[PDB]
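Page header: ASSEMBLY MODEL / three components / 1346 residues total.
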Amino acid sequence: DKKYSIGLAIGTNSVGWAVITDEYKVPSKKFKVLGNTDRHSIKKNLIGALLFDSGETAEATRLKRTARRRYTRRKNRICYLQEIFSNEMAKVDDSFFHRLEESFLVEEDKKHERHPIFGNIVDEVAYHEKYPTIYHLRKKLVDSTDKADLRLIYLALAHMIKFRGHFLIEGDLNSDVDKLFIQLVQTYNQLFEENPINASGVDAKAILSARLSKSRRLENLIAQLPGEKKNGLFGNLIALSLGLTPNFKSNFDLAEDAKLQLSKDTYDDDLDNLLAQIGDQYADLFLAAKNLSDAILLSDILRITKAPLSASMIKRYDEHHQDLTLLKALVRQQLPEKYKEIFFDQSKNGYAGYIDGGASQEEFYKFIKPILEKMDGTEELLVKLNREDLLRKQRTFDNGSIPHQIHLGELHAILRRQEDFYPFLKDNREKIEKILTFRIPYYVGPLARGNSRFAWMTRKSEETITPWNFEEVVDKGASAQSFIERMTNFDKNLPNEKVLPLLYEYFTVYNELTKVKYVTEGMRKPAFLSGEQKKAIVDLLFKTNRKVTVKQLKEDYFKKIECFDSVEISGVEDRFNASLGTYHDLLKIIKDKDFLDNEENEDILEDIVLTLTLFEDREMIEERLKTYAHLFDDKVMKQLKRRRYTGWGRLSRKLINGIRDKQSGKTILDFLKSDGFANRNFMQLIHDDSLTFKEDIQKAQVSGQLHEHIANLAGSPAIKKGILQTVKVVDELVKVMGRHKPENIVIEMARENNSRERMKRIEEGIKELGSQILKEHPVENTQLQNEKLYLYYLQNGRDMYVDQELDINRLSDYDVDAIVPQSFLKDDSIDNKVLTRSDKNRGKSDNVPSEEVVKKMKNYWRQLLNAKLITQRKFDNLTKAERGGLSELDKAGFIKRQLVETRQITKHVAQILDSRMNTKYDENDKLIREVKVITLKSKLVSDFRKDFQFYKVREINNYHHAHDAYLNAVVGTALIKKYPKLESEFVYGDYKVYDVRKMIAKSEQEIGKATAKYFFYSNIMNFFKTEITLANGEIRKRPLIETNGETGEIVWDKGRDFATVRKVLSMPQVNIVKKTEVQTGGFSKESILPKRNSDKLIARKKDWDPKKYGGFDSPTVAYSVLVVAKVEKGKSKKLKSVKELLGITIMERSSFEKNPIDFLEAKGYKEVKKDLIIKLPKYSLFELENGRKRMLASAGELQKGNELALPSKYVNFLYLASHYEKLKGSPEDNEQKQLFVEQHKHYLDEIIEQISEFSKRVILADANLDKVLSAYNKHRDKPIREQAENIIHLFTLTNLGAPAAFKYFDTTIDRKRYTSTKEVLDATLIHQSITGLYETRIDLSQLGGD
RNA sequence: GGUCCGUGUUCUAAUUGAAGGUUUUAGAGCUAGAAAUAGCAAGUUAAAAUAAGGCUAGUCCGUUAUCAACUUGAAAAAGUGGCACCGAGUCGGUGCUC
RNA sequence: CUUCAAUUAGAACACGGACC
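Prediction written out in full:
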């Protein structure tokens, strides 16, 4: 009952836990059941798992939420214009807005008249005939001096502000091809002085305005420059600028091809591979090639009048008509049978389907391309297709490229056009123009009043905000200053005050000063610097020299004042690593010593650095600089702006003057100065028990208390829901086993993040070698997962050790060879593996490949290296063979590369555990480690698992994850127990760092595995195996009881320590718990479904009708609930007791949670139970008679609640025939297992029986079950390896959660869906604690109302 | 090897501006036919909504994080489940402590 | 409910300089 070990299998989806004894075993306790079930007590084996859905990234939120701002800010300019325009709108027509706002409702509910534009039938059609789309009306105002009807002005300007086009252009609009093409060559010619270009003569506008296909257009420009072919670099530079996909593989002498698109998302990424191969050059020639390309894009939409956009938009439109009317005739004449579907069917992707139907321009367009070819005369309209310019809708996705300047001008023109006629229009021109120019800046964020957490803004004055007065009512300095401060860490040492980058310098001088010990000649004993000695030292030496030397100290100070002719300084280097530099920064510029030595200004001089450190805009500094101008000149001011300070310093200011030592009355900074004869360090000042500082800190630095300190970390939020829940598992254990602080604890995090590489790495190598062995014997893509078949082609069909051409059929005789032996490091990597007829020929075993083979065939190895068949490491190691002995550190690197991960995540949680569990401290100011927190790397965990015949199959059961929690658990222990000598490098505590030499031993294998120096070999797993295949072809054993020599403790006995493991995993019951989670998400799927008359559709708002206005559907419901109460059934509304589940749409939780009963009543339920119901998140575990279990689903929906248990004998089989090749490694170890592969056709039948019995028992998908059994019979005759993996997939109908679709050769078995929740209320129900060992079980057939 | 510093790159946490997908209507459809239905005509755009909605009425906030169950506790957060062995189809039994 | 862009924070890769 005393000494236990526990380990983990951290996972993004999985959380595995086990409870071993210190001797390796699982216990078998009995625990009680909560509820009203005749199952009082239960027997649980200690290990179990907890699975979950992973933690979400706030990006999903982020896109919906910022958008909710614009979607309401959009109408915040729309609302804004009405009011300036509200006054005279009333006189022209009383109801125009009160007719606009009501455009959705059908006329009868809708206010006023169904024609919003005019309210009268005749005129609205009259408008649509002069101007069908608004660009017609948009330009008409710009063209016509004649005053138009006011209403027309309003509608015209709405389409301007709502769709202003991006602000990505910073200024007033220099953007023609003409200006931004000559910058691509003036820098390209700047890029290449020699090898120049001519730019005077070239015309770009006439060549690059043209809508004609790009392919001729890129060709078209080169003929205007004889120098560069289209492949030629410049010629590709434009190709990118055109938006095509050009390849810089030829362009520079680059092995790896580079296809880049200006257009694509990844362009940034792909190109940044290139600027990393070119060195940081040509960011100009590619940005201006984007400038150009972007100055290319706009000219598509500018094809004399003032409104170019309008003109251009009309041009597409009449073009839309000319070709459209042109077209109908050809179908109706040449092949008229397809006119039927083209124009009428919105589902067909015919034209009608493009214009109103869901099909996007792409879908319609792709549909048209084969059609054209059959018709005659088509190709000219097809010319518009290649452009993709044919029959354009005005509003589309490419409309995404406008800047706000293009919209502005016609607005500003439109204003100029009608201002004279509506007087109030010209005076709000300024204001109205400002509605467009306004941009909520990035650095101001939102604009709250401080009642929402996100806004950081501060308002100089308080009044309702407008875009007109935005600049008057906002401190830019505080919107901006705040922006950086929130995201800048406060001190690592004081979390309650921002870090520095004067004080820190004022501190740093004094801190180093304290430890100086001076001995004049007289001094009998070396004494510290006296306090007054400091103030004399600060005044002169540090306020006149940047770095002050030891020689300065003697000469400047010791001779002059104290007349220590000779003297010794023993505390410090010659020149002080600290300095009064920021001080010295100001004397050069402000040049008023008496101003800085002054103490009063110390608050200001510090106030001023932050205000400098924060701002990155030279202008911006001015914003908060001005207040202090009335104290100095302007020429200092212009001298002042320039200087900049950054960096976030190690210390806080409220440590320095905020705390006080209540007894002594001295701050730490006050204390460093003048500490009396016993000067003391600042790090001596943190732990001094006489002083209030260690105890004043303790109240501060725990104010935060765990949802808080872990979400302080950084990384994927998927594992954040791991770590928070992983810790949560840990404490439930001490409840499972009596609040006991354990001996050791093992953690591991598996890594989060191939058939085609294998065939691109062979093709370029028989091409630069030039050989014909690729043309002598041919292969495929899906065959090179065979390492014997993939090590013939990396050695060019010639031996790697013997230089005979390799046979091509009998590879089962040739032998796998790791270059460096498996007793040093265990390598299945591609590079270490070499194929030869004979494993040994690489020479002596204990050594790496023999020195004799390096003299003969070194060159052949070097020969391949140039063809990228083998990595550099592969070659590098075989010269080490030639070189001689792998370094002790190379050996020592093998451990460090085996020893510990580098992911910081495995570190900052092990402090949490240190902090979390090792609460107790000793009375000597140190930390007790009764719990040794072990950090493992999975490959070691995995390799042993694979090394010693225990498999992981993800497909069969979640047991594999929970084992990994166990398997981790044992190994962390057995390491701190056999080698307590390396505890520092992996466990989270200060410990002993000796690795390089002791583990190294020379020449001792037989009594050197017992010396102080534990292991001559590098491999850390060797002792567990009874013997290690001593390198190549020789074998050396390991003593059967393995134990650390020093421990005098059986770290390991080979005979039986495994017997626990093999039998432990054999444990039939592992706890399996699915965290019930209150559901989260949107009220419904975002799509607005057509008008229909089905109840399920959700009204878009309270007024709206689903039966008439459609909207949402498939509403999602956070917790299902169980209720008993009578309901009305029979037109006489007779009372009838019932029992039926219900799903509570997260939409209705707010209505439900506060007042469940009333929400129950509005639904029509009556005689509501008082506090009988259960709140169940999804994933609730049911239990039925016969062991059937079920997991919660919302309506007549249920998934599998029963897991599959499997015997071990069957698991080790199933992966040997899964991995029939790529086993490689040791052939002899392979073959004794290989006998087994065809040896036991029988055990799978028992499996086939093991497999089948579960389906009749639990899932009762009796109609689905039958099909799968037949399919094995289809392939039953076939050899086992191929069949064996076909039944691995078939567990996915037997694997947890809902039935899935799963392949079986050409036979596919659809997923099974359960349509009714009715069955589980008769059943027993479950409530699972997070450990799942404890239970709350409610018999559900007792609670009912007749 | 470490620190710090520049830059570029990607990803994750926040801010801002742009283009959409969609639903209702406005967009009168016209020729012949009892009508149903044949034949032609036109089609691009515009408003309003983009989670219901809530109070603090903000140019706010609403899809992140958190949740086994019980006893409290308004919530947070504390408290609630015998041991030593034999063994295994999801856990049995055994016997000690109760 | 897709996409694109501005600004800042952190983590992982390439290059240069300063210190140990």
